[PDB]
Design an enzyme around this catalytic site. Structure first.
Site, short mmCIF file in Angstrom:
data_model
loop_
_atom_site.label_atom_id
_atom_site.label_comp_id
_atom_site.label_asym_id
_atom_site.label_seq_id
_atom_site.Cartn_x
_atom_site.Cartn_y
_atom_site.Cartn_z
N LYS A 173 -16.98 -19.08 51.24
CA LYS A 173 -17.55 -18.45 52.48
C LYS A 173 -16.52 -18.36 53.81
O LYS A 173 -16.62 -17.28 54.58
CB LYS A 173 -18.75 -19.11 52.99
CG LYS A 173 -19.96 -19.06 51.76
CD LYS A 173 -20.25 -17.46 51.78
CE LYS A 173 -21.62 -17.35 50.90
NZ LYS A 173 -22.07 -16.04 50.67
N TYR A 180 -22.52 -28.19 48.39
CA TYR A 180 -22.18 -26.68 48.60
C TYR A 180 -20.66 -26.67 48.19
O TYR A 180 -20.20 -25.72 47.83
CB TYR A 180 -22.00 -26.19 50.18
CG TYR A 180 -22.17 -24.81 50.01
CD1 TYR A 180 -21.44 -23.97 50.89
CD2 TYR A 180 -23.32 -24.08 49.56
CE1 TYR A 180 -21.60 -22.65 51.20
CE2 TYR A 180 -23.38 -22.83 49.71
CZ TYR A 180 -22.61 -21.92 50.44
OH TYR A 180 -22.59 -20.57 50.58
N1 NAD Z 1 -30.40 -18.57 49.52
C1 NAD Z 1 -29.79 -19.04 50.77
O1 NAD Z 1 -30.42 -19.69 51.41
C2 NAD Z 1 -28.68 -18.34 51.34
C3 NAD Z 1 -28.02 -18.73 52.59
C4 NAD Z 1 -27.02 -18.14 52.85
C5 NAD Z 1 -26.43 -17.07 52.27
N2 NAD Z 1 -26.74 -16.67 51.24
C6 NAD Z 1 -26.13 -15.54 50.39
O2 NAD Z 1 -26.85 -14.55 50.46
C7 NAD Z 1 -26.25 -13.63 49.04
C8 NAD Z 1 -27.60 -13.47 48.14
O3 NAD Z 1 -27.88 -14.97 47.74
P1 NAD Z 1 -29.41 -14.98 47.23
O4 NAD Z 1 -29.61 -16.21 47.93
O5 NAD Z 1 -30.36 -13.94 47.70
O6 NAD Z 1 -29.41 -15.31 45.69
P2 NAD Z 1 -29.85 -14.37 44.67
O7 NAD Z 1 -29.40 -15.27 43.23
O8 NAD Z 1 -31.14 -13.61 44.65
O9 NAD Z 1 -28.85 -13.16 44.52
C9 NAD Z 1 -27.52 -13.53 44.20
C10 NAD Z 1 -26.96 -12.34 43.54
O10 NAD Z 1 -25.58 -12.37 43.33
C11 NAD Z 1 -25.51 -11.51 42.13
N3 NAD Z 1 -24.04 -11.57 41.64
C12 NAD Z 1 -23.30 -12.72 41.11
N4 NAD Z 1 -22.15 -12.55 40.30
C13 NAD Z 1 -21.99 -11.27 40.73
C14 NAD Z 1 -21.03 -10.38 39.68
N5 NAD Z 1 -19.94 -10.63 39.02
N6 NAD Z 1 -21.39 -9.06 40.15
C15 NAD Z 1 -22.19 -8.46 40.58
N7 NAD Z 1 -23.46 -9.26 41.27
C16 NAD Z 1 -23.28 -10.64 41.21
C17 NAD Z 1 -26.66 -11.78 41.21
O11 NAD Z 1 -26.91 -10.65 40.15
C18 NAD Z 1 -27.70 -11.99 42.34
O12 NAD Z 1 -28.37 -10.68 42.35
C19 NAD Z 1 -25.04 -14.79 48.62
O13 NAD Z 1 -23.96 -14.27 49.25
C20 NAD Z 1 -25.38 -16.10 49.24
O14 NAD Z 1 -24.12 -16.81 49.35
C21 NAD Z 1 -27.95 -17.15 50.52
O1 TCL Z 2 -24.70 -19.44 49.92
C1 TCL Z 2 -25.72 -19.74 49.66
C2 TCL Z 2 -26.38 -21.02 50.24
C3 TCL Z 2 -27.57 -21.26 50.27
CL1 TCL Z 2 -28.17 -22.70 51.46
C4 TCL Z 2 -28.30 -21.08 49.22
C5 TCL Z 2 -28.09 -20.40 48.13
C6 TCL Z 2 -26.68 -19.56 48.27
O2 TCL Z 2 -26.16 -18.70 47.50
C7 TCL Z 2 -25.61 -19.29 46.38
C8 TCL Z 2 -25.19 -20.39 46.18
C9 TCL Z 2 -24.54 -20.78 45.09
C10 TCL Z 2 -24.10 -19.95 44.09
CL2 TCL Z 2 -23.28 -20.47 42.54
C11 TCL Z 2 -24.48 -18.57 44.31
C12 TCL Z 2 -25.20 -18.11 45.61
CL3 TCL Z 2 -25.54 -16.47 45.82
#
Ligand code: NAD
Ligand code: TCL
Ligand code: NAD
Ligand code: NAD
Ligand code: NAD
Ligand code: TCL
Ligand code: TCL
Ligand code: TCL
Lengths: 257, 257, 257, 257
Positions: D162, D155
């Site tokens: 974060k 990560y």
């Molecule tokens: N996926 C997981 O397991 C997880 C766990 C904890 C937190 N998150 C958080 O949840 C949020 C959404 O992630 P996700 O997993 O749904 O991924 P996802 O890839 O579906 O969505 C990520 C989004 O970020 C947007 N993005 C990136 N750069 C950008 C920019 N410059 N301007 C505008 N939009 C931008 C993309 O267009 C995309 O819609 C993030 O903050 C991520 O860190 C995800």
């Molecule tokens: O924060 C996250 C945490 C987890 Cl477990 C999975 C996806 C996540 O979301 C990201 C992780 C890496 C990058 Cl480059 C961009 C995004 Cl949105």
């Protein structure tokens, strides 16, 4: 409401000011069927009346200092609710002499024992007793306070009892999660209730919080009730073992003075 | 050494494997004058021998389950040390049936009461008893474990007792700081001691930690002893109410597996 | 002293009030051989003089905003210390307009970027550059503040930069532990230094802390220095990835007012 | 639904797997009127289609790396929603080379800068831009991850970003609370999304969590969506500045293995 179809037992209602009262109101509003307990006859009347207003006729006595009282209450509840969906634990107690002045001088072995027994052990005592009666998807909830995390004047031994209670929430969540039961706590900000009057200088704590809390007001039993309803509903299926602060942001700021 | 001129009482030595033993060794190395307590006659011999090796002839009996035993021990210590500079609390206990299996099924009202009484209340019980005997600049120290913060299998009710103990550290530090006394705790990683053998699957916990701890080894009683000496010395004058993790970084990593 | 045989690089000395100055003094007292960096010519003179008083003639320029400056400083240090035992990072910066008034109104994309770059990234930038030069048993140390954990008026974006820095400490400790390097931070209470004058109403923060801190006084650079020496010595071999609060217990109390 | 009468802007929808998609679905179900943004033309089509299915025709472009893009999007939104009730920030980014292998070796000044700019600064950048358009009672929400609190392999720099984001939540809540705006975050457990595929060994993280999480399953975008709806509704009026863990209890257990 999002609690339709749920059967929840509510402990701790002592008056209309009670946090448990605000919780019962919110859960009823969201569609839950409720049941209530009362500590002793000194409170039976008020609880019976409140339960009626909330469409419930299940009002049972239960003093958590006694294993027998807990077992009997659940055997009685089982005659009407052979299975149900969780309970709200809104119970705390410590002898009055414990909550005034210097902590080291005020605490006693007996005061310490009673505070932990009633304020922390009772939560797992109730879960042990009704474990086989809980439906998958059930949720248990207790109420804590910031004194578990920081030293607060006069709160004294109750702070230690609340720290034991928050740990209880985690061990309970870890043990019961596999069978489909979630366990959480709400760490509420200061609210004027009957029990609050027992804390020396409580009115001072209340005014201070009002001035420095980010949202600039103290929370109400409605604020707590709404959060409790959410945490006992299927809408919070992804949350277990958590202590949610419902204090308007008071604990995350410093020196706002 | 940086403990020259300090007089410190050490509780909890049961064998050469005891964390209290590593603490006593380090403090002696740094120049402190020591005094020891022993729980009962089953341990008197070993403690007397160790104390001799560390240049001490002050060995007193003390069972913290009894207020009378604590008061008597301090009255006796006062004949030789009318004033002193703090003590090390390295004592814990819970009935064995509490530390095996599902937490909700294993815990009992009595097991819970004893665990909190001996493992948490005793720390403030000792401070209450010797408060007038502490010199300004004194420091009190207790030992905790990660189970106070996270749910750990089999540790069960001891986790709740350690959470109460860490809160105790904060309330004690807040109450005694104005008179010049500091209070802290060390949350130590797993170490093979006599008491550790009572935790189901302890050997498994030890191997796991060794593999995932950042420093890639488990800590030793020397590691803990060195930290304890620092925390009871004037070198840590700016630290009070703190729980210092001495576990090689184990608690701040996740999924190293 | 317990630092005999250790070679440590100290950054951040700007004046006799500097926390890095108190750290250098304590480490010298405990036997460490020291080396110093200075940001620019505006500070070269004072640093050269202090280094002399502490028996050191290794004084190198280093501005952490530039990768080239960091690489050059270490190549120069390597001519005299081909291998060494760690460094103290006591560096922070944010444009002055960022530290006054409402946070949302004051913060800018550029102010945010600079604050994180200099106050957090620079710590891992230095470790990357000297990684092959560290002896097993080495220790890295940085300085944080409570603003990383709670919202504090006027501290604003520096709070976010300190939160990133504390996370940096954990990821660095996890990555470098296997090769024998420990990484920790000290979260110090308020101290009158040159940089402190840039925080609006700093004198008010100082008076408040003095009144409510458990030990009833604010900490000194000597208090911090002593803790830093311990954390960079082999006496703390069991501690890595930790943020130790050296603020007299201020952060663990609430409503002492 | 409990969101009837609320107008909320949702960022971050990239596909049906997106956490923002689950959030939009739950909020629509509860009665909120929605508006959506899309990063660039590569995503415009999918977002337009989803918005239609959810009864919305407000779909605007917005790349948070540019202040101009944010200002323009809000000026456009203002033509239809002169005032509204908050937004959901579900955006994160770091160059791919940053998320593989040893953290100290992988991180670069540029990778660090971009990660913090897009993943943390953008949240307050949006609030600054629409501050005068928020109705009293409004709520802002962002998404975090456990990597902000503990070192997690691969990560890497996203963990620091974060941590800065969670601090941002607190400073924002403290600054905007007096005018009636609440700010919170959800720390979600691992979920298979487009962005998740960029984390080395993500499939391994997912299987591990499933085995050791108290509720014995990983959370879904529906679990997160339901919690998000609650946190943006008036039902959570007593909660601000909080990071709520929606990970099934994973973070509060240790050694469940
Ligand atoms: N996926 C997981 O397991 C997880 C766990 C904890 C937190 N998150 C958080 O949840 C949020 C959404 O992630 P996700 O997993 O749904 O991924 P996802 O890839 O579906 O969505 C990520 C989004 O970020 C947007 N993005 C990136 N750069 C950008 C920019 N410059 N301007 C505008 N939009 C931008 C993309 O267009 C995309 O819609 C993030 O903050 C991520 O860190 C995800
Ligand atoms: O924060 C996250 C945490 C987890 Cl477990 C999975 C996806 C996540 O979301 C990201 C992780 C890496 C990058 Cl480059 C961009 C995004 Cl949105
Ligand atoms: N009031 C506040 O500001 C505040 C803040 C945080 C947490 N709390 C917690 O909320 C809960 C409810 O407190 P409250 O303020 O609504 O007070 P309250 O006085 O309205 O209710 C406390 C209840 O505890 C019950 N109780 C005590 N001993 C009992 C026993 N042996 N058996 C059964 N019931 C027993 C009483 O009968 C009473 O209904 C407690 O856990 C308290 O610690 C209150
Ligand atoms: N061993 C570990 O891995 C570990 C990890 C964290 C914390 N600890 C803590 O360190 C302390 C010391 O434990 P240890 O592992 O050195 O074990 P140990 O068995 O060597 O020592 C425990 C001590 O507690 C004493 N004790 C128990 N009941 C007592 C009573 N009523 N009165 C007086 N003394 C009593 C025993 O006589 C014994 O000396 C405990 O607080 C324990 O919880 C141990
Ligand atoms: N003063 C307090 O009350 C307090 C409390 C907690 C933490 N701290 C932290 O302690 C550290 C030292 O601060 P201080 O109060 O001793 O202040 P100080 O002004 O004495 O020292 C700050 C130092 O940062 C250095 N610095 C700034 N930008 C630099 C750059 N680009 N390259 C190289 N060096 C640079 C300066 O030259 C100066 O020596 C900081 O990390 C600060 O955040 C101070
Ligand atoms: O925990 C509490 C916290 C606050 Cl601020 C106010 C009241 C509380 O509740 C109690 C306090 C003391 C006793 Cl003896 C019993 C109870 Cl129920
Ligand atoms: O707290 C401890 C933590 C660990 Cl990992 C190992 C031993 C510990 O100490 C005890 C554990 C159980 C009992 Cl009954 C008594 C004591 Cl002293
Ligand atoms: O972090 C600090 C915390 C406090 Cl209470 C006092 C001074 C601090 O240090 C700084 C504060 C602001 C800037 Cl611009 C630079 C530095 Cl070094």
């Amino acid at each position: 409401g999002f609690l339709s179809g749920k059967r929840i037992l509510v402990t701790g209602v002592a008056s209309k000011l009670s946090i448990a009262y605000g919780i019962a109101q919110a859960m009823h509003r969201e569609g839950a069927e409720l049941a209530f307990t009362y500590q002793n006859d000194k409170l039976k009347g008020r609880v019976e009346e409140f339960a009626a207003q909330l469409g419930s006729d299940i009002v049972l006595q239960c003093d958590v200092a006694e294993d027998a009282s807990i077992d009997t209450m659940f055997a009685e509840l089982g005659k009407v609710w052979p299975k149900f969906d969780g309970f709200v634990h809104s119970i705390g107690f410590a002898p009055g002499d414990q909550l005034d002045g210097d902590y080291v001088n005020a605490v006693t072995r007996e005061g310490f024992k009673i505070a932990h027994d009633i304020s922390s052990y009772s939560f797992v005592a109730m879960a042990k007793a009704c474990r086989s009666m809980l439906n998958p998807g059930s949720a248990l909830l207790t109420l804590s306070y910031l004194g578990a995390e920081r030293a607060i004047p006069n709160y004294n031994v109750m702070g230690l009892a609340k720290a034991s209670l928050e740990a209880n929430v985690r061990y309970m969540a870890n043990a019961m999660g596999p069978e489909g039961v979630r366990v959480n706590a709400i760490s509420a900000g200061p609210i004027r209730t009957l029990a609050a009057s027992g804390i020396k200088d409580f009115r001072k704590m209340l005014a201070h919080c009002e001035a420095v809390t980010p949202i600039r007001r103290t929370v109400t039993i409605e604020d707590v009730g709404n959060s409790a309803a959410f945490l006992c509903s299927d809408l919070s299926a992804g949350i277990s073992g958590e202590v949610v602060h419902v204090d308007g942001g008071f604990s995350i700021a410093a020196m706002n003075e």
